[PDB]
């Protein structure tokens, strides 16, 4: 799945209050200074992947799932989060919604999505019609079974992207609001006014 953020503010404190995430692979900017830096646009690629493929989903690693279905560019700073939602949805006969493509003719550039209906050809013959020998439609369904260990569980993965632009930024909100005591000689910075008094 792929998404983007409009003009508002995203605090990660409520995100950190949701659940202990499995990955926390925020290899870009430091997690402490996430609220200090903010951008014009945010891409939210929140999807689900198998448990054995959480290892190679990083930009530094590649595989059949990475190079053919969804790839992340290594020359790009990113922050990804993932949690285990295997008990959220489980089917005894197998999850038939988690089919994935086996093969596409050319390797996929990072950050593109492509769906089509064509037949992979495995010989010097056209595959316009239907065939089952040396001409295969690329189809692979996992069929998630609840009676399996950690390797084949659906780990839902949220990929968060960020980039600069010539526009003012949206999601950091430096708003600093205090308690405003009523009778004391205290300092204040009301809308940038450096002053003291009672």
């Amino acid at each position: 799945n792929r998404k983007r953020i409009s003009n508002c503010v995203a605090d990660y404190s409520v995100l950190y209050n949701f659940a202990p995430f499995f990955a926390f692979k925020c290899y870009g900017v430091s997690p402490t200074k996430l609220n200090d830096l903010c951008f014009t646009n945010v891409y939210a690629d929140s999807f689900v992947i198998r448990g054995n493929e959480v290892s190679q989903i990083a930009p530094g690693q590649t595989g059949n799932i990475a190079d053919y279905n969804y790839k992340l560019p290594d020359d790009f700073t990113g922050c990804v989060i993932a949690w285990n939602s295997n008990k959220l949805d489980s089917k005894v006969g197998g999850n038939y919604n988690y089919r994935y493509r086996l093969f596409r003719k050319s390797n996929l550039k990072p950050f593109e999505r492509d769906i089509s209906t064509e037949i992979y050809q495995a010989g010097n013959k056209p595959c316009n019609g239907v065939a089952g020998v040396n001409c295969y439609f690329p189809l692979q369904s996992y069929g998630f079974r609840p009676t399996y260990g950690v390797g084949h569980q659906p780990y839902r993965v949220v990929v968060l992207s960020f980039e600069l632009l010539h526009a003012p930024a949206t999601v950091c909100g430096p708003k600093k609001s205090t308690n405003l005591v009523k009778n004391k000689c205290v300092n204040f910075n009301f809308n940038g006014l450096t002053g003291t008094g009672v």
Partner: antibody
Amino acid sequence: VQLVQSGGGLVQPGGSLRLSCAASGITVSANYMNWVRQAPGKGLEWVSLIYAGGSTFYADSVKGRFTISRHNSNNTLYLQMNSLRPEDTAMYYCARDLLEAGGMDVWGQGTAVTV
Amino acid sequence: ELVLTQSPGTLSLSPGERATLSCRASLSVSSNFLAWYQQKPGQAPRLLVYGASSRATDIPDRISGSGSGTDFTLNISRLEPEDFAVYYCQYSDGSSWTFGQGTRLEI
């Protein structure tokens, strides 16, 4: 539907050997293909995967010594062994084992590695 | 990665009988990516099943092979003299690979 391997022989450890994996009929150059070594008295064991794209999978023992490249004119694969070792005395298997069936394996050129 | 056990050391083949060859996987492993193949050393081997549901081609498919969890087996009802070769069961994840030393089929 059938494959032939050409160029094998017997060379000393520490050299480079070239082998060609060429199949007829099946356009194997755009498939998930794999490389297997089979020692005498030892069962079949996975060694390398190479895709239609540029994704290299290697075993821990072979490391980066193994080299694979695909030709575009025919269904021909050029593969190179560099700095051979006495632990690599094995018969060669080249196949196009995919995730659907992984079928139609090959007899493979039979070689032996010794000093 | 995967640990596989295939028993026994030697078979007890006699044509015209029902035989049971079982191989056991590591941790409740699935079977839609499991592949059986015949193998006789010296030449090209033969494939048996893909996906553990529909068998591969070039076989009349009288062997009933299936299983779940760590328990996988195949029962062959009618034996033929062309079956004198060792059978392997494998599982593929794309990032991890496994193999198993099969059981020799003789008398």
